[PDB]
RNA sequence: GGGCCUGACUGCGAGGCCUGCAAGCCGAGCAGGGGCGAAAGCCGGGCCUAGUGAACCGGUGGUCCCGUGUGGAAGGGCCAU
RNA sequence: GGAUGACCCCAGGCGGUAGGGGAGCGUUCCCGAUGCCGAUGAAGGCCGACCCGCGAGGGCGGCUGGAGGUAAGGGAAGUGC
RNA sequence: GUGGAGCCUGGGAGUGAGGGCGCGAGCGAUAACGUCCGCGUCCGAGCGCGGGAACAACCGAGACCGCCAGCUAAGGCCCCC
RNA sequence: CUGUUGGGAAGCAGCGCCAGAGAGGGUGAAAGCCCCGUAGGCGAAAGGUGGGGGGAUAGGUGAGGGUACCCGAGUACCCCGUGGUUCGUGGAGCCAUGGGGGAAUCUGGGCGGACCACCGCCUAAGGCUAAGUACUCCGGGUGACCGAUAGCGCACCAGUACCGUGAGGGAAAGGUGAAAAGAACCCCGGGAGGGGAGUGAAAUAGAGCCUGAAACCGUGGGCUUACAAGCAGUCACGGCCCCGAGGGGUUGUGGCGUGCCUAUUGAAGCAUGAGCCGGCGACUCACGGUCGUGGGCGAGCUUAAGCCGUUGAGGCGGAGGCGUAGGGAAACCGAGUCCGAACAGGGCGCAGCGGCCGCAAAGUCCGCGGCCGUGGACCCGAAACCGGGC
RNA sequence: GGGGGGAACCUGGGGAACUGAAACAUCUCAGUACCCAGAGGAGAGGAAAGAGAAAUCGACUCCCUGAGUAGCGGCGAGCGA
């Protein structure tokens, strides 16, 4: 369906995989929205007039003082009093339909694949945990850092070598997600990663 | 908290397949000796509640 | 496609209605509540689904009917759920209650009863009950009804 | 998060207060008083925009009338004569003529008498 | 005024009046079994419009529908009052 | 009309309280941002007869101020006295 | 008769203190800026505009914005005007 | 590292370098490489812990047959009064027990919703028992949390000052500068204060210190006002001043002109509120419901708690829920069913668009918006009622 | 060995009223607020004289669900396994 370049010692070969041809910007939007929303801490809080510290005494008599009527000084009308309808601890998460998430993953990859920004790699030459090593291979693959790259592979050693780059996001293949894909300019995948990606969207 | 079903409504009424609301006729509980047989017969039937009064009771039965 | 390109469809995300914020909003002062009265108060009215101003309510004047039940409650008897022949079309070979459950046709904890809307198909269908027409269409179609217990 | 008033209100008030420059006492110094005065001034302008068109016409009619009676007839006669003559030169211009170009106005008075 | 009578029916009820609701009112026709009439037909109380009271709770006659492991029973439901 | 909110032409509507609907402006915060504006001066303040917008507002220029601010596009509210 | 007409399903209301005036009645005293109904109207919400000296509801007229242009309505044309 | 602007480099420019470390905070401004850190590692003599690893210890162990000795007492059980359970005296069982009566030891007894039979379940009247669970004074980590009227009542010597006999009530108050370099000396003055000198990039940064709005008070300048009638403006013209066929300020005369808000049939109203300015101040959130709406899948849709993974990575989990059939009080029947003697009549129910394909759809899930139920539910306000204390 | 103290948390012994039912007494609020005793780092519970219909399960505790179901109720407001 789509044609994907692949770096191998045999050279830049191609691969065929069926990612959707249709992109639904709203759907991808919905997934990102759900992602960024369920990670919220919801730790904003305030005190109601009952949680405020002051007493419950009526500060001066109801009538006949020539002043306005009042109750306790915790009333939200007073300065220092409680708040009205302020924030309390909150859970912003919700359960986005699994089929939507799955479809979103496929769509996000497809969009990159369609741009030609998607690259699959067989192995990572000389990289063994050193950043200078990843830069070697990266440069060799056409990745000079002029474009931000989401690197997805299970080889911890490759992730450790590339994590500190300003232009690189790193991910275990189990961790593939549409936010990170959309954030980046290029998607680079381990064949083992590209394999489990195929399994999740299948 | 989740809404509670009104038990007075559950015992007096039924929501039909299309969402009409059907209850027994009123008026043959007692004092029937001088009522015509045409009355007692017709009052043993079920009837459909007027749209407004029907729409209200349906909200009292959220889990039917 | 980048983050700046992510947008919801028109009408997907709508602005909320804020009342009580100025004349020009058309929702100022009274904040769409009108003037005075119980309804305009914080707390408002009684349940509009029932309360009728003090008179005997529409609902309460209607008579009750039927067995309402008594403590200790529901009486355990077997329950039957029907599924039509037309639903049985999707299958081939044998059908049993457990199969119809996975298909999402027969709910759990319910006994199976085959009903007659639709057409029969030469299958082995094992259930607790068949309607009169269910048996006829099934015996006619070369299907095998099996009576469970 | 919290969104306190902060900057917004001071700015709205200054808009008004600048619009109220020149007014008497607190009307140009107090926001609230400035606003009450500005409301009136908006309605007055709108009303006086509409009535300025009247104020001038009445002046024009007075002036045309003054020059007409010098030639032995009145305004109401002069206008009718002009209508019968089919002269459609307006009152703004008739008045200007009556003062700046008196012989031209004389000729118009002539055609006004001739028309009837 | 008189004769024979019990339709002062059971099962329904097209279609309308009125009408916020709930009620209230009128009702041709079909089936069951009757009454009167040679018959056509009439009769689902009274020339008509007042003589009334929703639900809840409970009494009585019937029905034999539910019956808390099962058979019953206690107690309910349904029809009538 | 052109084909689609591209702009133009012709026509008609446009007082408004309770109130329904629509389109926007601005305030705090998040993504955009390991970015961008910034001591050749951030925010905030004081001016303006200038520019854009029907308006809410947004620009630009001068003075003050001396270290922060933050786009297009989206998100969420302790959001306008 | 194509109208901010009408009918059907549904979402959201507000109102359930009205008032003057004209005509038709009751009540009152062929009284009330009286009261209670009816048909209409206006004010309510047109305390925007011209007239009535001034004056919500009487006469004229339904104010999208602009003009130092023109025609009229009621009412007016001796001076204030 | 160097150059350059600058009081100051981390700015800009030139040439480099590290990275399992480009989280973050400092440093005279904006620093991966100056500092503190960060990734990744290392660390306890002493005290505490030690649920994991190891070892002891206590403790634990047969089968037939006979015997009918034992198996928890004012107990079971029954009645009266009550509590507990969803159960409000109801057909009212079960569990508990204040009063009365009052057994038995496996052929004993309790229970399965009055009661009886049958069939089953269980072992009362003695005791102990981890973990999974609740909480946050304390320590740490993290925020689409606050930023000095906010956030705890308290950022500051606050449960303080102050008030109260007492229980108890309960504030206000943060900021010089990069560095005190915190202004030597001289002058007027009793001092306070100020003027010079000096410091600093800046002193209307001078300690009564960042910024420094408004009301409010004053000084100087321009225009104007002592024959004039006023919701204070507005429209026109003219005079004067200013900035250079225009504009700004001012106001002499002429025209017009009944504050704002609230409540009302109706207010400029001699009806409510407001001295003025600044800041605080009222339609929200959760769960459920009902419409609408943006998408996903569609006779199907969807998971919950949890489990795994991440450390702002997502996945698993099908228990369950909604829908796929209705009608009936129910037994029950079922595209029908209920009433009925009816095969009568009636109530309530049943039946996509194009070339196997595409499109659309029941339904359902998630988001979003309107409104509704439940809670304080738009905010403020009673008089009162109750508990425990003073 | 006890005594007294500890922010909440926990068991036990006692235990309101405003409020809601658009009045009120049953009912609700609610075995809540509060008082007292006690226990600890947790407390409680716990090894069937159970459940309840499965010819079945197998201590207790805690979450999801079953379910706003079964039912309870001046069969009202509501309460709720
Ligand atoms: Mg948060
Ligand atoms: Mg929050
Ligand atoms: Mg808080
Ligand atoms: Mg607070
Ligand atoms: Mg409050
Ligand atoms: Mg309070
Ligand atoms: Mg309090
Ligand atoms: Mg308090
Ligand atoms: Mg306190
Ligand atoms: Mg109190
Ligand atoms: Mg009190
Ligand atoms: Mg008190
Ligand atoms: Mg006073
Ligand atoms: Mg005062
Ligand atoms: Mg008071
Ligand atoms: Mg108060
Ligand atoms: Mg208080
Ligand atoms: Mg405070
Ligand atoms: Mg506070
Ligand atoms: Mg506070
Ligand atoms: Mg507040
Ligand atoms: Mg509140
Ligand atoms: Mg809230
Ligand atoms: Mg939470
Ligand atoms: Mg939500
Ligand atoms: Mg969730
Ligand atoms: Mg990185
Ligand atoms: Mg990183
Ligand atoms: Mg990036
Ligand atoms: Mg990242
Ligand atoms: Mg009856
Ligand atoms: Mg009865
Ligand atoms: Mg009769
Ligand atoms: Mg009869
Ligand atoms: Mg009878
Ligand atoms: Mg009958
Ligand atoms: Mg359900
Ligand atoms: Mg259902
Ligand atoms: Mg929103
Ligand atoms: Mg507004
Ligand atoms: Mg609106
Ligand atoms: Mg409005
Ligand atoms: Mg107001
Ligand atoms: Mg409204
Ligand atoms: Mg409303
Ligand atoms: Mg009001
Ligand atoms: Mg009212
Ligand atoms: Mg109202
Ligand atoms: Mg009222
Ligand atoms: Mg209403
Ligand atoms: Mg209140
Ligand atoms: Mg109320
Ligand atoms: Mg009454
Ligand atoms: Mg039932
Ligand atoms: Mg039970
Ligand atoms: Mg076969
Ligand atoms: Mg503020
Ligand atoms: Mg303002
Ligand atoms: Mg302000
Ligand atoms: Mg300002
Ligand atoms: Mg402004
Ligand atoms: Mg002036
Ligand atoms: Mg002027
Ligand atoms: Mg002044
Ligand atoms: Mg003055
Ligand atoms: Mg002033
Ligand atoms: Mg204005
Ligand atoms: Mg005008
Ligand atoms: Mg005018
Ligand atoms: Mg004219
Ligand atoms: Mg005119
Ligand atoms: Mg004039
Ligand atoms: Mg003459
Ligand atoms: Mg003419
Ligand atoms: Mg003319
Ligand atoms: Mg006779
Ligand atoms: Mg006779
Ligand atoms: Mg005979
Ligand atoms: Mg009818
Ligand atoms: Mg009717
Ligand atoms: Mg006959
Ligand atoms: Mg005969
Ligand atoms: Mg016959
Ligand atoms: Mg008949
Ligand atoms: Mg009669
Ligand atoms: Mg009657
Ligand atoms: Mg009754
Ligand atoms: Mg009752
Ligand atoms: Mg009864
Ligand atoms: Mg039976
Ligand atoms: Mg039985
Ligand atoms: Mg039994
Ligand atoms: Mg027997
Ligand atoms: Mg039997
Ligand atoms: Mg018997
Ligand atoms: Mg019986
Ligand atoms: Mg019976
Ligand atoms: Mg009856
Ligand atoms: Mg037009
Ligand atoms: Mg118009
Ligand atoms: Mg309009
Ligand atoms: Mg009103
Ligand atoms: Mg619209
Ligand atoms: Mg809107
Ligand atoms: Mg704003
Ligand atoms: Mg906005
Ligand atoms: Mg950032
Ligand atoms: Mg930044
Ligand atoms: Mg720069
Ligand atoms: Mg500088
Ligand atoms: Mg500068
Ligand atoms: Mg800011
Ligand atoms: Mg501006
Ligand atoms: Mg400066
Ligand atoms: Mg500035
Ligand atoms: Mg900084
Ligand atoms: Mg800003
Ligand atoms: Mg931003
Ligand atoms: Mg934007
Ligand atoms: Mg976004
Ligand atoms: Mg938020
Ligand atoms: Mg607020
Ligand atoms: Mg209309
Ligand atoms: Mg209309
Ligand atoms: Mg409607
Ligand atoms: Mg609405
Ligand atoms: Mg609304
Ligand atoms: Mg009203
Ligand atoms: Mg009302
Ligand atoms: Mg009323
Ligand atoms: Mg009325
Ligand atoms: Mg009245
Ligand atoms: Mg009246
Ligand atoms: Mg007349
Ligand atoms: Mg009259
Ligand atoms: Mg009369
Ligand atoms: Mg007289
Ligand atoms: Mg009157
Ligand atoms: Mg009169
Ligand atoms: Mg009269
Ligand atoms: Mg009228
Ligand atoms: Mg009104
Ligand atoms: Mg008028
Ligand atoms: Mg009108
Ligand atoms: Mg007039
Ligand atoms: Mg007038
Ligand atoms: Mg006049
Ligand atoms: Mg006037
Ligand atoms: Mg008038
Ligand atoms: Mg009058
Ligand atoms: Mg004319
Ligand atoms: Mg005329
Ligand atoms: Mg006159
Ligand atoms: Mg005349
Ligand atoms: Mg005069
Ligand atoms: Mg004249
Ligand atoms: Mg230098
Ligand atoms: Mg340097
Ligand atoms: Mg550089
Ligand atoms: Mg890091
Ligand atoms: Mg950093
Ligand atoms: Mg840093
Ligand atoms: Mg930088
Ligand atoms: Mg920065
Ligand atoms: Mg740094
Ligand atoms: Mg570490
Ligand atoms: Mg470390
Ligand atoms: Mg033995
Ligand atoms: Mg023995
Ligand atoms: Mg024993
Ligand atoms: Mg017993
Ligand atoms: Mg007892
Ligand atoms: Mg009880
Ligand atoms: Mg009991
Ligand atoms: Mg009962
Ligand atoms: Mg009981
Ligand atoms: Mg007992
Ligand atoms: Mg006892
Ligand atoms: Mg035994
Ligand atoms: Mg025994
Ligand atoms: Mg027992
Ligand atoms: Mg028993
Ligand atoms: Mg049992
Ligand atoms: Mg036995
Ligand atoms: Mg048992
Ligand atoms: Mg253990
Ligand atoms: Mg435990
Ligand atoms: Mg914990
Ligand atoms: Mg902490
Ligand atoms: Mg903030
Ligand atoms: Mg901050
Ligand atoms: Mg302060
Ligand atoms: Mg504070
Ligand atoms: Mg401050
Ligand atoms: Mg503290
Ligand atoms: Mg303080
Ligand atoms: Mg005292
Ligand atoms: Mg003292
Ligand atoms: Mg006190
Ligand atoms: Mg205070
Ligand atoms: Mg400083
Ligand atoms: Mg300092
Ligand atoms: Mg001296
Ligand atoms: Mg001296
Ligand atoms: Mg001395
Ligand atoms: Mg000195
Ligand atoms: Mg001095
Ligand atoms: Mg000095
Ligand atoms: Mg110097
Ligand atoms: Mg400088
Ligand atoms: Mg300065
Ligand atoms: Mg300074
Ligand atoms: Mg200062
Ligand atoms: Mg500073
Ligand atoms: Mg100052
Ligand atoms: Mg000032
Ligand atoms: Mg002066
Ligand atoms: Mg004089
Ligand atoms: Mg003079
Ligand atoms: Mg002038
Ligand atoms: Mg000028
Ligand atoms: Mg004037
Ligand atoms: Mg007036
Ligand atoms: Mg105003
Ligand atoms: Mg009032
Ligand atoms: Mg009044
Ligand atoms: Mg009045
Ligand atoms: Mg006045
Ligand atoms: Mg006043
Ligand atoms: Mg006055
Ligand atoms: Mg009043
Ligand atoms: Mg007011
Ligand atoms: Mg005062
Ligand atoms: Mg003032
Ligand atoms: Mg709302
Ligand atoms: Mg939805
Ligand atoms: Mg989906
Ligand atoms: Mg699924
Ligand atoms: Mg449900
Ligand atoms: Mg049913
Ligand atoms: Mg039957
Ligand atoms: Mg039928
Ligand atoms: Mg579809
Ligand atoms: Mg909704
Ligand atoms: Mg609603
Ligand atoms: Mg509440
Ligand atoms: Mg609230
Ligand atoms: Mg209160
Ligand atoms: Mg009491
Ligand atoms: Mg009392
Ligand atoms: Mg007391
Ligand atoms: Mg006491
Ligand atoms: Mg003790
Ligand atoms: Mg102790
Ligand atoms: Mg207790
Ligand atoms: Mg005790
Ligand atoms: Mg007591
Ligand atoms: Mg009570
Ligand atoms: Mg309450
Ligand atoms: Mg309550
Ligand atoms: Mg309630
Ligand atoms: Mg009450
Ligand atoms: Mg009440
Ligand atoms: Mg009372
Ligand atoms: Mg209770
Ligand atoms: Mg207790
Ligand atoms: Mg203790
Ligand atoms: Mg424990
Ligand atoms: Mg623990
Ligand atoms: Mg044992
Ligand atoms: Mg269920
Ligand atoms: Mg009931
Ligand atoms: Mg309770």
């Amino acid at each position: 369906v789509y044609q994907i370049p692949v770096l191998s010692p045999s050279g830049r070969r191609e691969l065929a995989a069926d990612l959707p041809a249709e992109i639904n910007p709203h759907l991808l939007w919905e997934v990102v929205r759900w992602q960024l929303a369920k990670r919220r801490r919801g730790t904003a809080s305030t005190k109601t007039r009952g949680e405020v510290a002051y007493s419950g005494r009526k500060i001066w008599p109801q009538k006949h003082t020539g002043r306005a009527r009042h109750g306790d000084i915790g009333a939200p009308i007073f300065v220092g009093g409680g708040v009205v309808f302020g924030p309390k601890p909150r859970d912003y998460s919700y359960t986005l339909p699994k089929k939507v998430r799955k479809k979103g993953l496929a769509m996000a990859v497809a969009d990159r694949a369609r741009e030609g920004k998607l690259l699959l790699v067989e192995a990572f030459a000389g990289v063994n945990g050193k950043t200078k090593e990843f830069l070697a291979w990266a440069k060799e693959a056409g990745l000079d850092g002029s474009e931000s790259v989401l690197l997805v592979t299970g080889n911890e050693l490759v992730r450790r070598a590339a994590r500190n780059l300003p232009w690189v996001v790193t991910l275990a293949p189990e961790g593939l997600n549409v936010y990170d894909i959309v954030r980046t300019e290029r998607l680079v995948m381990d064949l083992d990663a590209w394999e489990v990606f195929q399994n999740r969207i299948g | 908290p989740k809404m509670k079903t009104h038990k007075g409504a559950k015992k007096r009424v039924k929501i039909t397949a299309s969402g009409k609301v059907v209850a027994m006729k009123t008026g043959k509980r007692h004092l029937n000796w001088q009522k015509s047989g045409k009355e007692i017969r017709q009052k043993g039937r079920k009837f459909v509640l007027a749209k407004p009064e029907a729409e209200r009771i349906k909200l009292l039965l959220p889990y039917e | 496609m980048k983050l700046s390109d992510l947008r919801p469809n028109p009408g997907a995300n709508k602005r909320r209605k804020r009342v009580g914020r100025g004349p020009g909003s058309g929702h100022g002062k009274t904040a769409t509540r009108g003037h005075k009265g119980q309804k305009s108060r914080s707390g408002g009215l009684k349940d509009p689904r029932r309360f009728e101003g003090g008179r005997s309510t529409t609902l309460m004047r209607l008579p009750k009917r039927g067995m309402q039940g008594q403590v200790p409650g529901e009486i355990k008897r077997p329950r039957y759920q029907g599924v039509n022949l037309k639903d049985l079309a999707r299958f081939e070979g044998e059908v049993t209650p457990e199969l119809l459950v996975r298909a999402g046709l027969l709910k759990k904890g319910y006994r199976l009863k085959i009903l007659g809307e639709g057409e029969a198909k030469p299958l082995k269908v094992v259930a607790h009950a068949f309607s009169k027409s269910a048996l006829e269409k099934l015996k006619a179609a070369g299907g095998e009804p099996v009576l469970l217990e | 998060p919290r969104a306190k008033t902060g900057v917004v209100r001071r700015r709205k008030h200054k808009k008004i207060l600048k619009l109220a420059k020149g007014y008497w006492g607190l009307r140009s110094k107090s926001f609230r008083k400035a606003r009450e005065t500005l409301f009136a001034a908006g309605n007055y302008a709108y009303a006086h925009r509409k009535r300025r068109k009247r104020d001038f016409r009445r002046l024009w009619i007075v002036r045309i009338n003054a020059a007409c009676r010098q030639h032995g007839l009145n305004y109401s006669t002069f206008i009718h004569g002009l209508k019968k003559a089919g002269i459609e030169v307006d009152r703004k211009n008739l008045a200007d003529l009556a003062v700046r170009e008196p012989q031209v106005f004389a000729e118009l008075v002539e055609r006004a008498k001739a028309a009837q």
Side-chain angles (χ1 to χ4, degrees), chain A residues 24 26 30 33 35-36 38-41 43-44 47 49 52-55 58 62 69 76 79-80 83-85 90 94-95 97-99 101 103 129-131 135 160 163-164 166 171-172 174-175 177 200:
Chain A
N24 198 340
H26 178 85
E30 289 210 355
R33 185 199 128 99
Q35 281 181 272
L36 307 177
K38 76 195 208 82
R39 77 184 200 168
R40 296 189 59 168
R41 295 284 291 113
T43 52
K47 280 168 164 52
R49 70 181 291 179
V52 103
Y54 318 99
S55 182
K58 192 176 177 59
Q62 171 78 4
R69 6 132 142 150
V79 182
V83 325
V84 178
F85 296 142
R90 226 168 124 195
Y94 55 86
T95 311
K98 289 170 152 180
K99 287 182 177 174
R101 312 186 204 174
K103 201 172 177 196
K130 294 290 292 179
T131 294
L135 261 59
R160 302 199 325 207
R163 60 199 203 184
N164 208 35
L171 269 185
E174 290 70 18
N177 71 85
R200 193 195 304 190

Side-chain angles (χ1 to χ4, degrees), chain B residues 2-26:
Chain B
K2 58 186 164 184
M3 300 193 64
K4 295 181 170 181
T5 271
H6 193 290
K7 296 303 178 76
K10 185 76 165 299
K11 294 168 185 173
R12 287 170 162 88
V13 108
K14 161 168 179 169
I15 297 186
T16 65
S18 56
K20 303 168 186 169
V21 178
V22 171
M24 297 306 297
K25 284 288 298 203
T26 40

Side-chain angles (χ1 to χ4, degrees), chain D residues 82 86-90 94:
Chain D
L82 260 34
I87 304 171
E88 292 171 26
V89 180
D90 63 21
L94 255 48

Side-chain angles (χ1 to χ4, degrees), chain C residues 55 60-61 63-67 70 72-75 77:
Chain C
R55 69 186 185 214
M60 291 293 160
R61 292 168 80 251
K64 305 166 71 188
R65 188 193 220 248
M67 296 185 299
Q70 318 79 13
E74 203 165 39
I75 292 160
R77 59 180 48 92

Side-chain angles (χ1 to χ4, degrees), chain A residues 121 124-141 143-145 149-153 157-165 167-170 188:
Chain A
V121 297
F124 290 110
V127 321
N128 287 108
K130 294 290 292 179
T131 294
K132 59 174 190 59
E133 294 174 348
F134 180 81
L135 261 59
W137 175 95
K139 181 75 163 310
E140 193 66 19
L143 307 171
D144 55 2
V149 168
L150 168 63
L151 183 75
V152 191
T153 166
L157 271 50
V158 180
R159 300 205 307 266
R160 302 199 325 207
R163 60 199 203 184
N164 208 35
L165 268 14
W167 47 282
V168 163
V169 185
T170 52
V188 177

Side-chain angles (χ1 to χ4, degrees), chain D residues 46 49-50 52-53 56-58 60 90-92:
Chain D
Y46 178 79
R49 257 182 260 114
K50 286 294 177 67
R52 169 173 55 227
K53 301 160 180 59
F56 272 84
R57 178 174 172 102
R58 272 167 86 271
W60 296 335
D90 63 21
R91 293 165 178 74
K92 180 176 72 172

